Design a protein around this ligand. Sequence first.
Ligand SMILES: Cc1cc2nc3c(=O)[nH]c(=O)nc-3n(C[C@H](O)[C@H](O)[C@H](O)COP(=O)(O)O)c2cc1C
Ligand code: SF4
Ligand code: SF4
Ligand code: SF4
Ligand code: FES
Ligand code: FES
Ligand SMILES: [Zn+2]
Lengths: 442, 257, 231, 56, 63, 90
Amino acid sequence: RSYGNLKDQDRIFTNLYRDGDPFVKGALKRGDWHQTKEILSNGPEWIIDEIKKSGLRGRGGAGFLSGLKYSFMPKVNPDGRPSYLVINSDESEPGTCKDREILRNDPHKLVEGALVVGFSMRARAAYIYIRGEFWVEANILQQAIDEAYAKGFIGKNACGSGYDFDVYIHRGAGAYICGEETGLIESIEGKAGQPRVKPPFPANAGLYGCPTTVTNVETVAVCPTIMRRGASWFASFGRPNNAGTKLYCISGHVNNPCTVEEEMSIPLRELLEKHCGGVRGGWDNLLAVIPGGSSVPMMPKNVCDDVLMDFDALKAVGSGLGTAAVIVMDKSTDPIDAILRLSKFYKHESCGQCTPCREGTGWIVDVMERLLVGNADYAEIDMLQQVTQQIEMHTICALGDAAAWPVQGLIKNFREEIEDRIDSYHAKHPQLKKSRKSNPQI
Amino acid sequence: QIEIFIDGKPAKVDDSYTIFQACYENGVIVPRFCYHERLSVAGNCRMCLVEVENVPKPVAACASQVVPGMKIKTKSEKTRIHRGNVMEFLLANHPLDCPICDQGGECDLQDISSVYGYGISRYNEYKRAVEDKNYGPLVATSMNRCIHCTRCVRFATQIAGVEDLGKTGRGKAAEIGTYVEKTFNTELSGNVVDVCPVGALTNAPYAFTSRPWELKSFYTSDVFDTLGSAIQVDTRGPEIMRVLPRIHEEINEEWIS
Amino acid sequence: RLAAHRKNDDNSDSVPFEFTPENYKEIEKILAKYPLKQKRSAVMPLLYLVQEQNNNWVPLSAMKKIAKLLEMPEIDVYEVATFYTMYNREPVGKFHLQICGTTPCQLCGSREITKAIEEYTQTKLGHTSADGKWTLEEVECLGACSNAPMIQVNNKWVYEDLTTENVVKLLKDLESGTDKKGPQNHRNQVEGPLGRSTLKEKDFLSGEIRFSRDFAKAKQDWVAQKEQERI
Amino acid sequence: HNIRYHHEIHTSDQTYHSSYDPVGETTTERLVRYGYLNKDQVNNAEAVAAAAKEFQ
Amino acid sequence: LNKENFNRQTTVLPHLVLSYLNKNDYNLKNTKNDYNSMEELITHFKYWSKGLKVESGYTYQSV
Amino acid sequence: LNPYSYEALKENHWLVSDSSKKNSEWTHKSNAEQLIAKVPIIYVDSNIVRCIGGTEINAGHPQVYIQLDTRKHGTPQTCKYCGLRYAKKM
Ligand SMILES: Cc1cc2nc3c(=O)[nH]c(=O)nc-3n(C[C@H](O)[C@H](O)[C@H](O)COP(=O)(O)O)c2cc1C
Ligand code: SF4
Ligand code: SF4
Ligand code: SF4
Ligand code: FES
Ligand code: FES
Ligand SMILES: [Zn+2]
């Protein structure tokens, strides 16, 4: 079938455009906190099975199966230590602006999902890690949590089911690396926030040495609606192994940048000229698209003309869905400049703990700065490819891979453009002697 | 008690071992910079990366437990490539300081580069520069040479019991040391020099005077305190040049005052 | 920023610091948010409190006071305050402008609005003005890519959809204090210009929305089917 | 900018060793010396066959 | 005949074979020394302080 | 100021100083300290300076990089091969 053209009834986030009050009154008017007592009455194993059968996958940029991952949590703690559920509300991936909309429009959905998931994994408390740049969103979520306490939905007799659940907000400062799960836990535990060496995994030893799980806002927020609607309803949308709806944020050189919600595995072009008003100057004016966050490698128009928007489809063409962030570029865009700015972003956000990332981010930026102006060699492109392959897959965490991928995509798609720039520079700038000293500082 | 394989030779170890411990006990030498036999396990450097089948990514030998039936290939070409890449990244920002560095002739960076690295460089940009700090008349600092190995921080926290050292900053511009101008005043302070693999921290009294190859060593015991610390005396001709600790495990462990 | 303590006459050990009683109540609430043995976890919130009550920057004496309060070494407070770029360890101007420069905002004209702010405030991209009213700084993505280009003020308020003249008008409004939050144009939060394209239905979006299920029968079916397949 | 193969991968360091038993040694002497037979059970077909199979 | 090239002076080029075959090694040796490369400076220091390391074995070579 | 005092030692890398610089013609057998002290401070615009001790590579000393962004603004720094001293301009 032709995926897309979702009905308004099947939207989960009906408050995304601020058509009602986001607080407890509007949340009850929209159906939040409805029949939650009946949900908590069933055993946690039933909730785990329902999430597994729903086919929901992580929306944080990985795509792991949420139900199985939640099932990884231990069933009992002989030590008496508690279990913690952590909501990854940190969002610093360039191009992605969806969880901000969720928090500032539908906070009670997040709270209800947190309660349901924590009950499913038998967790005592829930810590929501919001970035410091989301000041307004943090205030709104805190007010919603206060209302939830005042209405007796969480804490002490949470929904009158005998379970104790506290929801807390931990506001973190500016750091992209704090989005990584172990780095997030280290940031909560009064530390810098550097990622840990795994194994061990947070399912065994996480926050404070207790079992912990880290999950995105979107999955938690859609869990209660999935539970009420049913697993089959969620699985009825999208391709197999790509079930459910998805929030797409589109920005850049498109006519109508916006955030929408649509059935997963939707065609890319059909999405753009259905919701975002088409590419500026027409489809022929398109140069490249980044299907996910800045971590995902960029795509050329050749595959953008036909590719669908999901995990497997974007992975089969040398990309990934990531966080469903769509960046569109016109023919007036300089790909080298955009990728250089992305590399400069990744250079500033490295935590500096482990060697390959800490040196390779700076080396990549320094090489790309010369590649932009043409003051380079034809072999420097291959050297950069080799340097990226050395950085990736050798580091403590997955940020090194995220820094390596965009440069590899840029090389693979516009080696000819890079060569043309270098050729023009060397044709306009004759030079015979080669300096034995280092390159001038930029 | 599990059976593993190191370069094709079967071996029997305990299930609690790390790959590095098994390799060392079986006579296999793995390069390292941040791992120390008495401090906590850190995995910040990556020079101990090895190659294991059915595991796509290289695995850090020091910070990974052994698995029954696994095979470690320390002599494959993939391990050579891993070590070369890590050495390249380590030497990208290292200063050209060997003639003026007191670590020359006994630097682990030099020997590891010579034995395992590619042997030549291609980095042609400005390196980072770090201003030196003052820690007192016993420890001399040249912080351009630091590789952020955390050995000094772990030694100060876990062995000396003082909490004055740390890592402030982020990324490539992060710096190791005290935030404010403060001396590293403590007993067992000079020991931190022996912990640091590079010439970042050096013996300030033993500054520029000698080189490792022109010294003769003797084993003896100390009398300055009633613990008979096992010590090594390094001399050049009729002049005693320095004193180093030894290993006893019943006296002074590894350390001297 | 330098990853060390710069020698400053107004930021020495002799500089006094003390939490306000309202900040002390906030401190006890924050410590109640965390386990008894994990008081150090409250280092990040308390820092904000300092930055709230001391003109948007954190002095060294405040960090020492936090270390004493949380029974943790001063070096850990130093590491936390230096790791995160959102904490100011030096005094900053009255209006701290943080212009986004990441590629999604760069494609929409971040450089042009940066040049406009530069030419209005008479202050460079990474600099504080002579009078101390403005501090221009470039930052990474601020999570508002759809409403690009956008800036943030004082780590508090975000302003989106800026042009060459709209950013000048916004700066004048900020000077006069009569500014408008959110987008500087007709755009209504995240929905794109030229109207919206989804959530068009209003009868369903203005009435009571309910979805009921029989969880008792669901559980009985689940237990019956798992028992049957196990048999 | 290519540095990965500045060092030789294949080198001429191979050594080959050959070890032989004494030419004048008989089968019985070889079986006795290698701990597959004893001097007493010499000149017996069953002992010789068992030692030969054990050796093989 | 060339006017400004070095080959005008004489027909002997003692680096033509070496540059023809081992171009990669010729390029590296002519660009990096112990004054602008860390690896090369480490090699120089080890070479002139302790010497090169030779794997254990026996050889006999005659000329 | 007493060269054996706490302040003088602390601001001299914990070494006994010599303002006259004339002890080194006997202890170090040359007058190089005086000559290098005769060279004024070079003021650099950027935060980092590169020293090679000459006009070309191999005529001087290996490339070294000196930080001029100090804890105290404008503190001069000395090359560890050649005695030249640099400071950030204003
Ligand atoms: C460098 C880095 C940054 C990340 N940033 C985020 C982030 O901002 N938000 C998020 O939800 N996950 C982020 N992740 C992914 C998390 O580590 C983790 O995989 C995810 O939160 C799992 O949740 P999910 O199953 O709901 O996707 C990041 C991962 C890495 C390596
Ligand atoms: S890969 Fe980079 S961000 Fe991740 S642990 Fe290493 S230094 Fe930190
Ligand atoms: S620490 Fe010193 S001897 Fe060791 S390689 Fe580095 S500069 Fe050379
Ligand atoms: S100063 Fe030396 S020992 Fe200390 S962390 Fe740095 S490299 Fe390691
Ligand atoms: S020695 Fe293993 S990571 Fe450092
Ligand atoms: S790139 Fe500017 S808000 Fe994301
Ligand atoms: Zn010099």
